[PDB]
Amino acid sequence: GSHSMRYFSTSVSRPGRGEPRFIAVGYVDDTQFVRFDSDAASQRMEPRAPWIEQEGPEYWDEETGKVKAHSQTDRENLRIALRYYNQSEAGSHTLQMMFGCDVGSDGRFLRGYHQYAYDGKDYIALKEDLRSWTAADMAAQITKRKWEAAHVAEQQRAYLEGTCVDGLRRYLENGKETLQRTDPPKTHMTHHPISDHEATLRCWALGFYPAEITLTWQRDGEDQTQDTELVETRPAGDGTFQKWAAVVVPSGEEQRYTCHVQHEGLPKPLTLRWEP
Amino acid sequence: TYQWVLKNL
Amino acid sequence: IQRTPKIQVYSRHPAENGKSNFLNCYVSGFHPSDIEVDLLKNGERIEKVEHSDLSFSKDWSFYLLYYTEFTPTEKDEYACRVNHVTLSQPKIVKWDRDM
């Protein structure tokens, strides 16, 4: 239905061990499709999904050019940041960036993003209107004044609504077989006794794509949050995802509990009940 | 399609 | 501002003794990005372990997938060893086929 494209970059300084390492990765929804690593031998933006290899030679030259320029920009920004926070040149610092867009089922613009984080904390973010900045602290406030005066957001806006959307649209078509598929979860419930009085019920969801899913426990058809354990959705490594939800229950009361599985690959949500 | 990231903080 | 890694050790497919599978170690929610992740077989480091490209979540916390092709058995005990600036010592998480 709705689709996203995101680019995530990480610049990490390592004083005494040469210049900062720069790593950038690109995603369409939950599928990685490109990478660039400043420490790799190739010095090129590399394919990471089969369907991105159908882009011609000029795409790889242009994209390599872009990712290398961002690599240089964020090396400078690491130096500007030290000065703004009055930090020592000897310590290791991190500059992260994310940018990208959201499109509807019609392949039309919904939302745009362009944001930084310094040492794992919000630095500056482009607001939803694509005309203003959310600066988090005093240092980011200096950048905000600089970027607003120079009308920099118009360049972000022209990218996010244009180039970003066109690329996302072209990728969805070229990788249709992969990106526009829905792999519903394969579900099951397991039972694990604790004591003579307690047991754990674990509701599993496996082999699903996209990553978004909701697992809920209910007792007697009433929502249950107490005695619940939910693991983070995790990648299987084959392009699909996994998740589980567990509840600690009194012995003999197992069947009063139900697991509710919500996934866009499902025609209806699934309800699971322990059936020995 | 990547963006041109050229502005400084 | 330093966050400790969450760790999950699990197989790609439901484990069957004598069948090829993939052993995974998912580290997430950590900062800074430098991290040491090994997959162990009976307490010994597995040699050919691949990892995913450094990426991150909405809250800016990093995640990585470390994986190796393996064939589980009844005897063989698998684990993941993780070291990070936030950890006073490497954390060992045993592979539990029911988790």
Author numbering:
A (entry chain A): 1 to 276
B (entry chain C): 1 to 9
C (entry chain B): 1 to 99
Recite the paper's sentences.
HLA-A*24:02 allele, highly prevalent in Indigenous populations, is associated with influenza-induced mortality, although the basis for this association is unclear. Here, we define CD8+ T-cell immune landscapes against IAV and IBV, restricted by the mortality-associated HLA-A24 allomorph. We identify immunodominant protective CD8+ T-cell epitopes, one towards IAV and six towards IBV, with A24/PB2550–558-specific CD8+ T cells being cross-reactive between IAV and IBV. Consistent with the HLA-A24 peptide-binding motif generated by NetMHC4.037,38 motif viewer, enrichment of Tyr/Phe at P2 and Phe/Leu/Ile at P9 were observed.
We solved the structures of A/PB2549–557, the overlapping A/PB2549–559, and B/PB2550–558 peptides in complex with the HLA-A24 molecules at a resolution of 2.90, 2.95, and 2.16 Å, respectively with clear electron density for each peptide. The B/PB2550–558 peptide differed from the A/PB2549–557 peptide at positions 5 (Ile to Val), 6 (Ile to Leu), 7 (Arg to Lys), and 9 (Trp to Leu). Both peptides shared the same anchor residue at P2-Tyr and similar solvent-exposed residues (except for P7-Lys) but differed at PΩ (P9). Structural overlay of HLA-A24 presenting the A/PB2549–557 and B/PB2550–558 peptides showed that the antigen-binding cleft and both peptides adopted a similar conformation with an average root mean square deviation (r.m.s.d.) of 0.31 and 0.37 Å, respectively (for Cα atoms), consistent with T-cell cross-reactivity observed towards these two peptides. Structures of HLA-A24 with A/PB2549–557 and B/PB2550–558 showed that the antigen-binding cleft and both peptides adopted a similar conformation, providing a structural basis for T-cell cross-reactivity between these epitopes. In compliance with the in vitro data, the structural data support the potential cross-reactivity of CD8+ T-cells between the A/PB2549–557 and the B/PB2550–558, verifying our previous findings of broad CD8+ T-cell immunity against influenza virus infections. Likewise, cross-reactivity between Vic lineage and a variant found in the Yam lineage was also observed with the PB2550–558 variants (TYQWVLKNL (variant 1, both Vic and Yam); TYQWVMKNL (variant 2, Yam only)) in the virus-expansion system, but 3/4 donors did only respond to v1 after peptide expansion. The superiority of IBV at inducing cross-reactive CD8+ T-cells in contrast to IAV was validated with the reverse experiment, where virus-expansion with B/Malaysia/2506/2004-infected C1R.A24 cells induced highly robust CD8+ T-cell responses in 4/4 donors, capable of cross-recognizing all three different epitopes.
